[PDB]
Design a protein around this nucleic acid. Structure first.
Lengths: 94, 107, 80, 99, 99, 80, 108, 94
DNA sequence: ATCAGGAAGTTCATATAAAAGGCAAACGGAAGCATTCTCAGAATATTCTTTGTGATGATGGAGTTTCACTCACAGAGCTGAACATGCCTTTTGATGGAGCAGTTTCCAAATACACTTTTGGTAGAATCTGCAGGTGGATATTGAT
DNA sequence: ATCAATATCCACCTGCAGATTCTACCAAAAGTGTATTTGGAAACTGCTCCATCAAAAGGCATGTTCAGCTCTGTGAGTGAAACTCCATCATCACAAAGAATATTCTGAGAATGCTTCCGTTTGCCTTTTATATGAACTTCCTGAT
């Protein structure tokens, strides 16, 4: 059997800290897996066209920020930007 | 000798794998080279959206007296919420059903 | 009896009740069979095209999912 | 003395998640429409493809009747005619509409 | 005595190409809406962006009235009411419809 | 006089005639001004985002074309 | 030595579109790592066919409109009067193109 | 001034073999120039995805053939495939 | 204001399928060091966007009449859901089976890579022509007898 | 069924805006060896989809009625297109002007390449649990009074 790797053991870790007493069935784990694989291929595709309109070779954090701000609508983007800036600040510190 | 290995996910304080996001941005042919802050940003954004939907789905599961989330509850959680309905607009969720909505003229 | 006649009157009536339809005309039972055949023709063509490019004779679930994804009907639940 | 049951039927169907077209009468319709594109060669389908295509084909029809019934209530009617579905597939456009 | 001239105006407007909104009341509307997104910073607009956005903001409205007048003729009316435009923007959906 | 009142009555009538409308209600001159504002608020936001990423202060034609292209409204004639 | 002269591989295939430029764009656009040598040849022929498909209908519309030079309305008509180009260029607005001269029949 | 290449001299050669007594204006040259850049990235983006679904590293002729057959509608992807095949089979015989 | 009777919600027990849990292995993420190389930064030309300011005729705003159009209502006639009854397509399931897709090895032909030379494509000139506005006649509506 | 006015169409003239044609030259495409690697081909296996048979019952097909609709017509009353007029506002020209974009050269910090080693992730048995299902009770909601 092949490797067949996915996001099923990370979506569950997020679930066990947004609702500590709630499991999730198998098909509703496959749906969250497909959702993550879709939002990934959406944000990375928009960042790849942003890096290619401006003659860059590098997808830094700035293209991911200006791709989140184009894809995600409304207050969801303004929360996601501050969720990511905190994490890259904590990364560059440590 | 070397020092103790620390994962970038646990260094940035995230839960999604920054190593796997870095590998899938290199192997996906999006651009030539990939910076070091782009997977740390992207894993944070993916963790935020997943933590959004798994909390609305948890509320919709708790309101139905069940302790396990079925695809019906994700259909309800995404379609009742104003901006996740606009994000996942043209998306069919399998074994999901519809929202209960009878036109008020018919009653 | 034809194969499109297997999409019976209780099936079209019961999809229409899920959509919320109160009274259902007697001519709609061929219009629904006309729309369903056009949808299945547009989806099975790309399912077979993605199959034939990979040199198989088995239309897997990912080929139907990729046929739906490129028409703007992204299906969650079958690998993606 | 007869009573209504459509309002009890709409409510019991909109809280269900299962499929409304039977499995085999769709599993042979799809395999017939496949033959027009494979030049007489009989392709195999998986069992997870004849559900993946049925899950899409019913969530298309349910939303089509929800969009057409607004046209029905728009013209003052209650009864869903074919001239409502044929307009709800025209306003949606070329991609979302026909097919 | 008053003769009808709507039939002579639709034909002379469907065989022309030029823009039907005057250029300056659009050219300050776009620069007004552009303030709210730059946090008070006045951006400069090129002279070929205030046309390449008017060419789309009129090809949206003309197609919107073409898709709402089918709803007006559907209900037996001839007069185009706002409950027609608000329905034709709903049947199109989230993407093609609003915005 | 607000600037959305610059989208006058005969311009809305003149667009509806090109759309092919025989008679026009008087309440549509506010619905059209409320639809045009939402279309411009969705296109100007993405044009400004493409400008701010490129570290500029001028909104070119390519920014507007990239804003229209990603909402499914591909514009031909200004560089694509 | 006797270095032989160049034949362009637009002329080796008989096309009119540049196979070298199309190869360089497929190679620089980051679509894949390797680019096969038959792929710009196939793609340039497809692009030439579609360009001829549209310019022929546009020339016929410019001839029907008593004119010589093709303007953008002669492309709008050429694309929207055709059942399979209207389906391809469906969500495409063409600047200075106008609309089709349509009046509903119940008005007349 | 940068070089600013385009398809403007090639759309003109294709025009003057199907209508030898017909010219084309500058804006209708720009529209035909944007049409080619649109169908180019459409076909190349579909054929970049066929060869990534199937774990390949080369966009051959076969990916462009099935991407033409996916994108172009009906009786137009029946002519375009033949126009490409009769160019490849005479490229290789040279 | 009053009862009938099925519909729906409670609630407790129970199988059982499904989810959580434990354990190995392989594979890929990380540490570390040597190397390249992209891009932010500084200095500079030059393009092109803004604001004014005047001239000005093009066109929209305001108000008043008149008649095509919307809307509520009533009545004739069609038709679709409800009900009774039988019976026939779906469904499960079950094992045999055989077409088929996933895995592994090997190598050869197609693809990249590096260098030199020719050559075609873009930018910038001089130059020629299609067409839009204008002036004026033949002809296809639109009354109103 | 017929005469005036008029809107449409057309025949032609020409000014000029714009397309066409003519030239340096520069980047880039093509030819020639070199080297490396991807993927078509063959062998094989183990997964998995098609086919069939008995049944079994549940859901569908058919007939019939009747009450809830659709459709058409009518009249009252609302409201939008047509029409006038003039003054306000958008269009144009333009000289300048000056911010802000585009181009060029530099080196340093960030990214890659390669090696080693170790810790994470997934796959496969094993238990333990949430949920479907049954069955009686109780409320309660709708038709009737």
């Amino acid at each position: 059997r092949s490797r067949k790797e996915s996001y099923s053991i990370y979506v569950y870790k997020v679930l066990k800290q947004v609702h500590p007493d709630t499991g999730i069935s198998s098909k509703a784990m496959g749906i969250m897996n497909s959702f993550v694989n879709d939002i990934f291929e959406r944000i990375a595709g928009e960042a790849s066209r942003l890096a290619h309109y401006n003659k860059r070779s590098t997808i830094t954090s700035r293209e991911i920020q200006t791709a989140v701000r184009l894809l995600l609508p409304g207050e969801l983007a303004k929360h996601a930007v501050s969720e990511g800036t905190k994490a890259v600040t904590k990364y560059t510190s440590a | 000798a070397r020092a103790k290995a620390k994962t970038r996910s646990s260094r940035a304080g995230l839960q999604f794998p920054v190593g796997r996001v870095h590998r899938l941005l290199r192997k996906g042919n999006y651009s030539e080279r990939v910076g070091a802050g782009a997977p740390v940003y992207l894993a944070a954004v993916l963790e935020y959206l997943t933590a959004e939907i798994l909390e609305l789905a948890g509320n919709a599961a708790r309101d139905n007296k069940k302790t396990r989330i079925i695809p019906r509850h994700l259909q309800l959680a995404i379609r009742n919420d104003e901006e996740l309905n606009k994000l996942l607009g043209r998306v069919t969720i399998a074994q999901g059903g519809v929202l209960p909505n009878i036109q008020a003229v018919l009653l | 009896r034809d194969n499109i006649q297997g999409i019976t009157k209780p099936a079209i009536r019961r999809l229409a009740r899920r959509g919320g339809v109160k009274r259902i005309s007697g001519l709609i039972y061929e219009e629904t069979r006309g729309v369903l055949k056009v949808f299945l023709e547009n989806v099975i063509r790309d399912a077979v095209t993605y199959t034939e490019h990979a040199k198989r004779k088995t239309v897997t679930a990912m080929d139907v999912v990729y046929a739906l994804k490129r028409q703007g009907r992204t299906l969650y639940g079958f690998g993606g | 003395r007869r009573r209504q049951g459509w309002l009890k039927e709409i409510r019991k169907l909109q809280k269900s998640t299962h499929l409304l077209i039977r499995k085999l009468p769709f599993s042979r319709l799809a395999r017939e429409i496949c033959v027009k594109f494979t030049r007489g060669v009989d392709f195999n389908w998986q069992a997870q493809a004849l559900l993946a295509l049925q899950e899409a084909a019913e969530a298309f029809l349910v939303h089509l009747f929800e969009d057409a019934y607004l046209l029905t209530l728009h013209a003052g009617r209650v009864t869903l005619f074919p001239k409502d579905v044929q307009l709800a597939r025209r306003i949606r456009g070329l991609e979302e509409g026909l097919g």
